[PDB]
Design a protein around this ligand. Structure first.
Ligand SMILES: Nc1nc2c(ncn2[C@@H]2O[C@H](COP(=O)(O)OP(=O)(O)OP(O)(O)=S)[C@@H](O)[C@H]2O)c(=O)[nH]1
Ligand SMILES: Nc1nc2c(ncn2[C@@H]2O[C@H](COP(=O)(O)OP(=O)(O)OP(O)(O)=S)[C@@H](O)[C@H]2O)c(=O)[nH]1
Ligand SMILES: Nc1nc2c(ncn2[C@@H]2O[C@H](COP(=O)(O)OP(=O)(O)OP(O)(O)=S)[C@@H](O)[C@H]2O)c(=O)[nH]1
Ligand SMILES: Nc1nc2c(ncn2[C@@H]2O[C@H](COP(=O)(O)OP(=O)(O)OP(O)(O)=S)[C@@H](O)[C@H]2O)c(=O)[nH]1
Ligand SMILES: [Mg+2]
Ligand SMILES: [Mg+2]
Ligand SMILES: [Mg+2]
Ligand SMILES: [Mg+2]
Lengths: 384, 383, 386, 390
């Protein structure tokens, strides 16, 4: 648990992390696994939330916005609700005579309530929010710093939405010192409600993002200072035989797992008795992609994580890896054949066989050749 | 062949995209696979057919605010078909915590073509939040195999902004992230504030044109969720036996024999060559592949309905010669070389060179209409 | 005719057609003529519609979109295509004899579709449940009954390339293919995003596009849309500019005694041209081959510029106010090309259309001016171009 | 006149013309003069309209669009209101159906529709539905009328579109690419009735209505209209006329307006002007000819200087103001940071630091960057610098 430990450390130092890398690495997996292993709660709900950003995601659905529920009810977004839940659950365990635990528990029932709030209860929600935000501030900073029952928000594909538009006052408030209990503790007031709001130290944010798409890759340095940035690189050592066996023996603790570790034995013996076939295959593929495009368009290891037989590797190759490589290099046949290091040969057991016709201006072109059986493993052996 | 690989890749990945040039039967094999898999010939209960375009948003697809005077969160097409797949999968799932009457009322509210009344919309929201309270406590090994199979064919999936339309479906569509999967995700939707997760009951078959690169699926993160099947042009369907085997698999009556001799009247005029259209499309696709992209190849649907020589003349002069002149605009040498008539500037040729020559040295050609045996003699030159 | 049979054959075979070519070749003319000759109606409405694509259409104004309908209601309203493709389907279900077809409801749906008044707020949900009953009926019908609906409906989409068709034709990338129409071997019934009600293009309907191919900025670069249409190149025919063909074209509509004047007006024309019936024909030929060699083949001058020419003053006005500005707009400030199109490149300072200016610039460049020639010097200048 | 006769015959033969040329040649004035000579109305209103296309002119404000309008003075709603062209086309068609002798026309309906097209106030919702129903009756009525009735309509309506290229003419027109042709109008041979997108009601251009556009061909950022859009309009070149700037010619043009005793004042003011220009009655004429020929060889033919800048010139200081505020910013706008060419148009190329319009600065940049400064000349030096342009 090393990536687990660095997510655990950089959440307790920066307050919030972003798991970046190429598509196919373990970002969403390590985020969801870390949060269900810290909260001890397998589903989203009270103690943690899972959201996904997109271009149809705005400030009004994230922090607060007007909604006709008629008059305008200032409906809180998901961040305001999880931050208020984190603050109220932290003021549960915070023993103090000024904290009225009867009103704080009523605010926790009003925040936990999955039903839409009645207009008889929305005024109670506003009054208890005013009492909560007039409670803190009068609370000392050394008590507001230590809040035990931590809350987590996983913003998957965080670079998909306009984060500077979605995060409103959260550009300022998400810094660890600008949270509650910190030394530069800052409680700003919100536009649509007028109520003061500040991020508690009880709530952490684990973003994940892919760095392949550069049109949505974040460049706001003032936004990037709020987050730690954990690079989840492609790990081809997960595709070694014993490591792939140990990974696939996670949810396999029955006799069917006995049908698993022999199914790899049919696989890796057919690959040439090499326990490092997929490992060095993805290694050579990623190191050849890194030098012709970038390191952020590397093939992640989750393409070959579900490979159990040779036909599974054939389907992952011809329907997930080769269309991805042909979308990487559109009509650039020399570069994609260099990625498979087939730049010299034009025929034979090859993935792109040369057409026997050259253009009127000297242009040439290739053809996707579907290899099967030992010829396919022989062509994959050439990449290593 | 293609049916078996669609059935195989739809189970291990959960969603497939049939891509390729126009003309190859991607929508055909998607519709045929889904009708042969659901045993119903109309979209509706167990499968839906949609087509993405630029007026698809996240609101019309998953959920969005719509006034009905009360602004309510109207579920889009995917949330209706995903809740329908989840509820219909929770029908046959025998358990003690699943109240079958609420699940059945939710299925009646989901499969209702009439718009829901305000007395039934709140019941719909209550049954939805009961459903999402239910599957948040259900084990993984019971949700892993829901009994029916629901399909959503998204034809021309690349014509809309897919990463904008698939709002929370970038995360949830992965087979290891569906309900009952090894890493089960349940996102929180922004508009309703209600949780949501794609069941393993529901499969997606996208189709995609790859000739147009302005709508190319360049999102590397979104290409990981789908398995990408290339439906290539198959010129071997235009062989004289395969043309009779394909065109008689749609009709069942006596007039199939009227199909037969009309084909034999065709290929006797082409030069007694049973592989005339096959080698014609193969040679033309090799020319297009070497002078333009391989995604601009001519599909076989142009020549599948060719049954006489006049239909081949109409398909040539009104479907693929405007297509070739649109491929190579004012590049007369390249379209001249695609029909391999680069030296032939006169005679029985498709583009006769004008005798007049411009002042800066440029020369132009003229589309010549060939009929009868001269047209077949010009088509024999391409082979 | 010939082009009439071309449009008829390709529209029956394909379902949709696009008459494309240079401006002024009779694409809108042969489209409107074919549609008023098939459906015997001189005015759109019942059996056919005429629309024009441009950048202010969208999917909402063509298929369906949300609109306010009077309190106020947020009502999804069908566009022109959904209205005509429900009208063609419902009119096709009149002559279908079947037990499951409830014609008392189909006739009410036809009355609500052909209702020129806007729908009442108590008559709109009647139309909605009638559409729901219709799409429950059509999905239950066998394919052989929907294969050949009895009438024929036409939608002339003129200047089709001027709008963003891939944005406008939302589901119609899929549905316009004749195998995906109703009763086809591979029929498809999409679900529309705004309403949620299903939709499918009947075989009753026939869309006819016309396209300007002189403009390259709006051309059909979309290859997948070009499968759905047949493509008729409507070339400029200068053989219509002969004296006998002008007498056949111009004296066809006005069948009164004025033909006995009009041919007289033609006899003053070509005798002023040199007693040559092929003056305008070879003039348009030897201009369009110049436009074909120095520009693309589809920036050519259409024959509709010279069809209304009756006297030499009309030819002078058509030359100096319609096609010489057009040639000056083709080759803007490119004098050695527009002068070469009129094949007066070596000529200057005479009976010429572009007189050379006596001044030369500091970089050695020169520019010419437009010279207006009248009388017989203009005809001697036009005789040079031939 | 002759230009008005040319506009009249090309407008009767094509239905719509465009007066195109450089700025300041009087294309708007020629269009307005011809229209007020036709309809005999000094102001727009019933029989003719005047609009200006700008960059933000849209189809929604030209044919029909969802415009906000208040219902019962309480709340705004977006309803489909007709633009300028649809209102003037319905007005022309209804006014032509006034004098049309036919029995199928319900005149007491049609006249009411004319009132609903001529009231200069927003329609109340009680009568806006009446206006919609009368439009539906009108398009049901002309859908059965023969061609011989609708061919000849008795009045003549005009729509002047000043600066027609400054908008997106295809996007603003829309259905008017097809409808504006003389054969595609009402009562024509190939009569066409489109179906508009927003209101969903039919529409067709009457032959009653004519369009006279003006086109500034100097700029070319937004000036490119399509070839099919060139086909609909006749195109009338309005050149700069420097022969309007001769002393007797400028006298007759300035005296064509109403002047009781100020004609002799204009006479003694114009004799004061040309006596300082070297006793040359043709000085402004050949000045504009030399500067326009020198514009034509280096710039486009459409970039010439219009003659109406010098039509108000009566004194020497008026000519100095016109030069230093109306034609030298025009030249500096055409030749932006092209100093040798704009110096060659005035043919003072190489002649620096004299009685010059563009004085060369005596500094030079790090890599040889050069700059010129607009020098203002007053008195005999300005007339001397004007003398060497010729
Ligand atoms: N056991 C194990 N499984 C992993 C690991 N990394 C990825 N996986 C598996 O691969 C699948 C895909 O990984 P995932 O984390 O979802 O990619 P991603 O980072 O979200 O990809 P993207 O969203 O940026 S496109 C997951 O379902 C997970 O089960 C790992 O380190 N260990
Ligand atoms: N029998 C049979 N018919 C086919 C086959 N491939 C294509 N066709 C026919 O050709 C037509 C075109 O196939 P289609 O599915 O529409 O291509 P497409 O993928 O939609 O092409 P596009 O949308 O990218 S433009 C179909 O109507 C189908 O009937 C095939 O393999 N077998
Ligand atoms: N008789 C006859 N008349 C024609 C023919 N072509 C054009 N015309 C006449 O010329 C006029 C212009 O034709 P039109 O239909 O507008 O050309 P177009 O192809 O639409 O030109 P555009 O819209 O791209 S600009 C028509 O009104 C018609 O009367 C023809 O082939 N035969
Ligand atoms: N008497 C008389 N006045 C003229 C003549 N030409 C132009 N004018 C006057 O000069 C002024 C400018 O003319 P104008 O019509 O605006 O030219 P323009 O082509 O429209 O200029 P622009 O709009 O492109 S900048 C007008 O006020 C007009 O009255 C003319 O020939 N005779
Ligand atoms: Mg992810
Ligand atoms: Mg398709
Ligand atoms: Mg037209
Ligand atoms: Mg003006």
């Amino acid at each position: 648990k090393e990536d687990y430990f660095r997510v655990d450390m950089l959440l307790n130092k920066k307050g919030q992390v972003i798991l970046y890398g190429p598509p196919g690495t373990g970002k969403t997996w390590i985020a969801r696994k870390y949060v269900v292993e810290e909260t001890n709660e397998k589903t989203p709900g009270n103690k943690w939330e899972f959201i996904t950003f997109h271009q149809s995601y705005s400030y009004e659905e994230f922090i607060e916005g007007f909604r006709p529920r008629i008059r305008y009810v200032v409906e809180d977004g998901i961040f305001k609700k999880i931050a208020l839940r984190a603050l109220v659950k932290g003021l549960f365990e915070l023993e103090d005579a000024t904290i009225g635990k009867d009103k704080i528990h009523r605010l926790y029932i009003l925040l936990t309530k999955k039903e839409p709030l009645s207009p008889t209860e929305y005024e109670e929600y506003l009054r208890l929010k005013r009492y909560l935000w007039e409670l803190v501030g009068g609370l000392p900073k050394d008590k507001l710093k230590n809040l035990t029952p931590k809350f987590y928000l996983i913003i998957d594909e965080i670079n998909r939405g306009n984060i500077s538009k979605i995060f409103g006052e959260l550009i300022t408030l998400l810094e660890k010192d600008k949270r509650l209990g910190g030394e530069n503790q800052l409680i700003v007031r919100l536009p649509y409600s007028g109520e003061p709001f500040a991020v508690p130290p009880n709530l952490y944010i684990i973003g994940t993002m892919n760095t392949a798409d550069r049109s949505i890759a974040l460049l706001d340095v003032a936004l990037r200072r709020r987050f730690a940035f954990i690079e989840v690189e492609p790990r081809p050592e997960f595709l070694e035989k014993e490591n792939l066996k140990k990974i696939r023996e996670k949810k396999l603790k029955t006799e069917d797992r006995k049908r698993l570790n022999e199914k790899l034995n049919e696989l890796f013996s057919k690959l040439g008795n090499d326990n490092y076939f997929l490992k060095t295959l993805l290694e050579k593929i990623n190191v050849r992609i890194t030098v012709v495009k970038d390191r952020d368009h590397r093939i992640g290891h989750s393409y070959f994580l579900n490979v159990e037989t040779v036909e599974d590797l054939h389907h992952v190759w011809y329907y997930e890896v080769l269309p991805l490589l042909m979308e990487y290099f559109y009509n650039d046949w020399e570069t994609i054949k260099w990625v498979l290091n087939e730049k010299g040969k034009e025929h034979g057991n090859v993935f792109f066989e040369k057409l026997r016709l050259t253009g009127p201006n000297g242009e040439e072109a290739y053809q996707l050749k579907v290899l099967e059986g030992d010829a396919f493993i022989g062509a994959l052996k050439r990449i290593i």
